[PDB]
Structures are given as C-alpha cells and as structure tokens.
Amino acid sequence: ANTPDRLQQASLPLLSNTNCKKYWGTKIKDAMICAGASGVSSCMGDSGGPLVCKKNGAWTLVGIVSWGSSTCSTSTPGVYARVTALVNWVQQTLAAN
Amino acid sequence: GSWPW
C-alpha cells in the first residue's frame, strides 16, 4: 500500500441511494450518501474527511468519508455520512456547548 | 466487501 505525504483531492459524482443499492444492497441507509464509482476512490485514512460540493460560490460539506470497498475499488461507490441528515444534530450540539 | 475508511 502507499500513503501520501501530501494532501490529495479528487472530483467525483454523487449517486442516488436507490442506485447505490445496486452495489451495496440494504447496507445503504437514509443517513448515507454514495459518491464515486468514477475512477477514483476514498481509501483507508480518508475517513472523517470531507465530501464537499460547490454552489453559489462556496463549498458545503455534503458528506463525511465513511466506508466502502475493502480494496478501494474505483468502480464501486464510496459511502459517506449524509450531512443533511445529521446537521440538525450538529447545530444543536454547538449551540448547547 | 465493506470496510471503514
């Protein structure tokens, strides 16, 4: 295996959960969003980092790197925590702490 | 095959 010293990036597309289930079946839950299967893959050590999408001039956290192919296959979608499903919990935790 | 990343 190869770990990079320098920060890496990749562009990759969002999938629908319905379509992502063709790869992963019932493992895909509403609080997940799939991305990739596009010739890149997140991989071990990427977890917890961002999946960001740009709109109206700014980058928004849409996913958190979570899980996927045990071989980091570039033809299988990666699975990310779906931030829209989780953001109400975030904002509250901040405001209460 | 799934795995934490």
Partner: protein, 131 residues
Amino acid sequence: IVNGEEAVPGSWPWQVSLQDKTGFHFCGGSLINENWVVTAAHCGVTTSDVVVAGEFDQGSSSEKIQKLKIAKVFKNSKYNSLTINNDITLLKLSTAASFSQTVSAVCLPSASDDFAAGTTCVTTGWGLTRY
C-alpha cells in the same frame, strides 16, 4: 484517495488531520468554526488524539501547523457502529484554532437542501493512494 491528485497547498483550509500521540494520521476531519471539527464516529477519537490544522505535506517540518488539543468528543447518539450509520462525531477544541489563509471553515447545509445525483463534488485527504 486512489487516482486523485495532489492539492494546491492550503486550498482546502478546513481539512484537518486527526493524529494519535505518536503523530500517526488515522483520519481526516473538517473545521466548521474556530472551536469545532466534524469527523466520522468510527474514527474512534478521544481526548488523547489531536487535531492538526494547516497541514499540506505531513513529511515537512517547515509548515506552520496548529496542533490542537481536543476538550470533548461528541459521538452522535444515533451512530450505529454495526451498520456504520449516522457516522458522525463532533470534536470541541480546548483552545480555538487561529483562522488564516490556510485554516478556515467549511459551510454546512440546511437539512432540507437537495444535492442531486450526478452532481460533481470533491473529496480530500491523506488516505492511501494505492491499496
């Protein structure tokens, strides 16, 4: 990231590295303000790990990085480690990050925002480039 490319240094200023006591990078995270980082629950962070902000080259000693202590770990109650669902943790920093050109926050969505299938997004990190 397999088959990605090297980033412009400092161009993903919310990206942090979660490192253990030995300095080993084990996960990424994202700054959402000066006091809080969002990461994955399954990263298993505790208050003995540290958040490293401002890094590009983890093999370089010449970067002005911020090694930030973690005061508290907030694992979302909904996290199910058996299904890896609701995979999110918040880290409250002991001392605020100092924002700069290379250290700043990512935006968060509203719960009702739509991100359509087929949209091209970006992911970043120091994960493996070859399995």
